[PDB]
Design a protein around this ligand. Sequence first.
Ligand SMILES: [Mg+2]
Ligand SMILES: [Mg+2]
Lengths: 116, 181, 78, 66
Amino acid sequence: ARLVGVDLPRDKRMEIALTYIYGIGRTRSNEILAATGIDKNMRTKDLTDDQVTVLRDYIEGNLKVEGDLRREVQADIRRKIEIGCYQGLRHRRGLPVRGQRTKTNARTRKGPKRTI
Amino acid sequence: KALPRLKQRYREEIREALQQEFNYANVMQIPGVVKVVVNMGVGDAARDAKLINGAINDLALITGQKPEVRRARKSIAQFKLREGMPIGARVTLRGDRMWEFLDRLISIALPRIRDFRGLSPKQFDGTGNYTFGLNEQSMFHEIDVDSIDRPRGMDITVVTTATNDAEGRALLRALGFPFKE
Amino acid sequence: KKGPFVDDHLLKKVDVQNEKNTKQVIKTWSRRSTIIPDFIGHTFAVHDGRKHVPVFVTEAMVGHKLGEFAPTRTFKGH
Amino acid sequence: MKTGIHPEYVDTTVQCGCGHSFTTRSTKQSGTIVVEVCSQCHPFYTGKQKILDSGGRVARFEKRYG
RNA sequence: ACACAUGCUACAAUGGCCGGUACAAAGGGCUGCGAUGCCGUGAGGUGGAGCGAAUCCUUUCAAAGCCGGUCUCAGUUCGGAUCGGGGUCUGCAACUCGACCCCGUGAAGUCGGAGUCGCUAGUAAUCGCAGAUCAGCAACGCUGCGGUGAAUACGUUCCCG
Ligand SMILES: [Mg+2]
Ligand SMILES: [Mg+2]
């Protein structure tokens, strides 16, 4: 259902359903449920409005919203690219930032296997 | 409920606010909402002639009227089109239905947008007529979340009797239009 | 872990900056003082002999030389 | 308006977790709409949160402590 | 911006996650191992009984293995890489300069064509343990170890020696 802007699965447990958010996953949802006092074995078809609101405000207070995290990643990436460092150079060239193999690997970051 | 909520509150509060903000020096000169034109942006025609029915059904349950289709005014070569094909469906709300749609929108749709920031007030033409758009689909709670197959946004233009963009901005501000500066 | 080249001057400067909690650039003069854990991301304007460039130090940068983010030996070839 | 080319039109009351009550004509025959959002914009705070989340200097500071 | 060689991860139900459980041989230790505790999601900050050799970690020894709950056979609770935020072990100095932990991010991979490799009984397969050097690791590699452990073997017409 509508929690922060994303829809949850139809028939799935809570700890796996909360993974749809860009800032919550399996263990994060488990910790949130443990802190809020909600079970994790419940399906995604028996939720209450009060529980929805309490979880929403709890995540908004402890963590930040999915869009917040998205645009924060974007802003950090563009900032580290504009400062003009090694990370920025690698991001501009489409190469790994953590300094790993780049001879034949790094296709996950360079895109499909292109040959020219 | 002789009059809708928006019409009732505008008959006195918005009218007095506008008359105090701009001295018109005579009655009948205060700006007022004339109509609301909602058009379903389409153009996938020439490749699928079924989604037009879905667009019409979406305009239905969103506006208390039967939308009509506007045919191609001219055949284009680059974009696949043909003179006479139904390209887009519109509704022209006015009166009690217009006020009802406006208040329902302002109350449910705008706060329902994902990552909603607001509406820009610069979307004003040279005649105090506002224009904005719903991006993907399903901003109102009349259509089921699962009853929709693909996103089909729309464009809503409120035509009021505001001779100036400043007058239109003041009218919308008096109304429940959330603006961001 | 013995006493490193901590640049006592820079160390005390960073200590007082952390105490007063005023986010501002610190004009440094050394280039090999990135060791003591007391440097809470204090942005050092380093002196490479030519000018002072403002560069903020990061986590992976913890440990590296102060003036080593960009190539200090300016040379491209073209 | 014509005879029946449009769907039913009846009044409906909208509720919220904060107690905000609204009433307007719509197509819902149930006449009750329990919604999680009404004329009280939590985006008003969500935007300031979007803005406050920014800042890389503070992250550098904290996660360095070096 | 690419190609070749050798290994790991897998591609899902003989499966994934959580809780409870049993035996193996092999030792790395003197500026190294380091059990009980304090607090920690966890690397780990406090640290010492004990060691030129059974009082001490590698446990009075692990994984596959057995019992219960759940996922309902799908790009997913399979797979884990890139990437961002919160940290740790070494040494003065880890983006170019290791490894490891927590949170999110969730791409290719649906057992693979032309071609080709290893295996005759404790063999293949599968699982982990330990070590050579380092204060700090690229170590998935190279060597030894054993846990559970299969089917075929008309025959040399036939590809290679
Ligand atoms: Mg609300
Ligand atoms: Mg499948």
